[PDB]
Structures are given as C-alpha cells and as structure tokens.
Design a protein around this ligand. Structure first.
Ligand SMILES: [Zn+2]
Ligand SMILES: [Zn+2]
Lengths: 122, 121
RNA sequence: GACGCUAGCGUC
RNA sequence: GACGCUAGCGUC
C-alpha cells in the first residue's frame, strides 16, 4: 500500500508521525519533517557518539511519554541540519483507511511512498 | 525439483544430497544413508533436552579434523538415533550449474521435501 | 533442531 | 541509524 499510514509507539501506541512526512536519506535512513513530531520524542546526549557516512550521531531519542521512554532511534547532524533518525522496529504501522496494523522489523519490508529527503523543504 | 549438493560451509567438504533428505514433522530435517555417517562426528549434547518427539542426545560436527564445524544435533526419534541438521552450517550447490546458495532457515530452501518414513531404509 | 529474547561486539 | 558477528537466554 502506498496509502498514507500512521506510526504508533510500539510500546504505548501513542501517535508519532505519518508516512506523508517521512523522508529518506541515502535510500537507507529515515527522518520525519515538521515540528509536531519534535514534541513526540525526547533526546539525551548519546552515551557513545560516533561519525559514520554522512551523519554525526549526537543523541538517542525516546518516546516523550515519561511512562514509556521507548527507544525510537538517534538524533544526528546531517549536512547543515540536526534531524532525528528512526527505526521501524519501535513502531506499529497503522493503515488510516482500514486500521490494519503491521509490525515491521526492517524498513526494507515496509513498502510505502518513499519521498527522498529534500533540503529545500527545510 | 533438481538435485543439489550440501557442502560444509566452513571447509566446503561434501556432506549429502537433497535426494537423501527427509523431513520430520515438516520442521526438522534428517539425512538417510550410510555415506553420511562417515561425514560427521558426535559429542554428547551440553544441554540434553526432550522436545516434541525428540531426545536431544548429541551435537554433530564436520568429521574433518581441521574443521569440526557445528552441523546440528543427534536425537532419539521413536526407535531411531538420527541426525538433525541446520542449513546455516552448509552451502547449497546446484549440480548442473555449480551455483552456490547460502540459506539461513529451511523455510527459504525450496526443493522436493520428501516426508520421513520409518519404513523407508 | 525449530523458535523466541536479551546482552554486548564489530562495520560505514 | 543501517548492517554484520558473537555469546548466552527462553519455548516445544
Ligand atoms: Zn511510547
Ligand atoms: Zn567442514
């Protein structure tokens, strides 16, 4: 399905983002656009920051719900931007039209409309 | 479908053929024939366990001394002491072409899976 | 053996 | 984050 879909925290089922705001960096990593998502996660300086490829691993990000704090991914410095990078294993994908939920472990198995990251959008 | 060879993934020594492979409970895989018994050695299992219709009695390893790659287990099934192998320990070679394939789980290997028959040899 | 989990470890 | 490896752990 290329239809729009929701991402919920796999632990607490809180809404995180929608597939329409997802951008793909280097056909491998996934980020979310908009400020509404920044409220849904909290970050902490990474216990072991690293530089790889085109990223600066600076922080870990977690579900903002203090009762949850589920690991969602990392926060990196990419080019001139500081953006979050998420892993799908921390989320449940819900089809908006039908409500069907899907548990992915790797992004290669989630087939949705993947918009390439565009710097001009930010 | 076509017959294929299984080589030890570490030392590439031939172990068996898909014709001699039988399936137990559509989940476990054993090898028929006496040629295969020359290809593995056994060692009593560190954590013996009974599960389903199996008594986990030993681990099995490649008989080549410079290899001894872990190949699976050896179990007591019904009235038989038979080996049970895991595909991750082997590389599958096609007979006609020599194309090699590395499988990690049996569910991804598609061939004519003949069910184990206690009457069959 | 099938499968599940955790934990580190390494790579760009 | 993506991938790889290891090591145990749990289930029949
Ligand atoms: Zn949550
Ligand atoms: Zn060997």
């Amino acid at each position: 399905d290329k239809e729009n879909k929701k991402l919920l925290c796999r632990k607490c089922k809180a809404l995180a983002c929608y597939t329409a705001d997802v951008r793909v960096i280097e056909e491998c990593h996934y980020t979310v656009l908009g400020d509404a998502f920044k409220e849904c996660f909290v970050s902490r300086p990474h216990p072991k920051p690293k530089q790889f490829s085109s990223f600066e691993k600076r922080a870990k990000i977690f579900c903002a719900r203090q009762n949850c704090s589920h690991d969602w991914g990392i926060h990196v410095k990419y080019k001139t931007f500081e953006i979050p990078v998420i892993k799908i294993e921390s989320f449940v994908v819900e089809d908006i039209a039908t409500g069907v939920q899907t548990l992915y472990s790797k992004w290669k198995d989630f087939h949705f409309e993947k918009i390439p990251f565009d710097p001009a959008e930010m």
